[PDB]
Amino acid sequence: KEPCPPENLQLTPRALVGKWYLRTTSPDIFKQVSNITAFYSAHGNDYYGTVTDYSPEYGLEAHRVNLTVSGRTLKFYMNDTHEYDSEYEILAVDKDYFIFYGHPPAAPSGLALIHYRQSCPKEDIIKRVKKSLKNVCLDYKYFGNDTSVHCRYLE
Ligand SMILES: *[C@@H]1O[C@H](CO)[C@@H](O)[C@H](O)[C@H]1NC(C)=O
Ligand SMILES: *[C@@H]1O[C@H](CO)[C@@H](O)[C@H](O)[C@H]1NC(C)=O
Ligand SMILES: *[C@@H]1O[C@H](CO)[C@@H](O)[C@H](O)[C@H]1NC(C)=O
Ligand SMILES: [Zn+2]
Ligand SMILES: [Zn+2]
Ligand SMILES: [Zn+2]
């Protein structure tokens, strides 16, 4: 129902800018959605962006999203479904990845989402991810990966 964050961590400006691949989550949401790709342009400490994401039934759908940042959390809102909307606590930041925990409609119990800079990361990265997850009461064990985009290091 809850992890154990860094004592602060906070964030940094323009840190979530650019393009990320959401390939690992706990719980695994990858039966429902797949090939999640997300581009972020930074309006100050906030950001707007688009989240492209293939469903089983329907095609490659995008979503308009805005992140209203405020310390070590942010309000994720998407103008479309309003289903993954929630305050999200940043749990780790890095060059190649960042991790967020939150309690959307979809996973009120709690949802952890790992974004990656590259669609298939090298094993170096995955290990730092491992580290970060442990540092905050979590493990790759309970994290499901998006197989729909093969990556050997996410197996
Ligand atoms: C994932 O999206 C990218 C967007 O260009 C595309 O190249 C790739 O083939 C996609 N695969 C899907 C929709 O599963
Ligand atoms: C994000 O979108 C919501 C949608 O209602 C809005 O209330 C909020 O002020 C927006 N923040 C911006 C524009 O960064
Ligand atoms: C996700 O990938 C990691 C390796 O990167 C692995 O340890 C983990 O068990 C995988 N989870 C599933 C269920 O795919
Ligand atoms: Zn919580
Ligand atoms: Zn979608
Ligand atoms: Zn493989």
Author numbering: 1 to 155
List sentences from the manuscript.
Diploptera punctata, also known as the Pacific beetle cockroach, is a viviparous cockroach that gives birth to live offspring and secretes a highly concentrated mixture of glycosylated proteins as a source of nourishment for developing embryos. The principal component of this milk is lipocalin-like proteins or Lili-Mips. Lili-Mip has a lipocalin fold and binds to different fatty acids and other moieties. Lili-Mip is small (18.8 kDa), monomeric, and glycosylated.
The structure of Lili-Mip2 showed that in the ligand-binding pocket, Glu-38 is held in position by hydrogen bonds from His-115 and Tyr-40, enabling ligand binding. We hypothesized that the kink formed by E38 in Lili-Mips results in a preference for the binding of unsaturated fatty acids, with the unsaturated bond occupying the position at the kink. The mutation of Glu-38 to alanine was predicted to influence ligand binding. Mutation to alanine only slightly altered the positions of Tyr-40 and His-115. Mass spectrometry analysis showed that all Lili-Mip isoforms (and Lili-Mip2-E38A) bound abundantly to palmitoleic acid (16:1), palmitic acid (16:0), oleic acid (18:1), and stearic acid (18:0). Lili-Mip2-E38A did not exhibit fluorescence intensity change on ligand binding. Therefore, we could not measure ligand binding affinity even though mass spectrometry analysis showed fatty acid binding. The crystal structure of Lili-Mip2-E38A suggested that the binding cavity did not extend to tryptophan. In the bound fatty acid in the structure, the distance between the terminal methyl group of the acyl chain of the fatty acid and the ring of the Trp is 8.4 Å, compared to 3.8 Å in Lili-Mip 2. We propose that binding of the fatty acid at that distance will not significantly change the tryptophan environment resulting in a change in intrinsic tryptophan fluorescence.
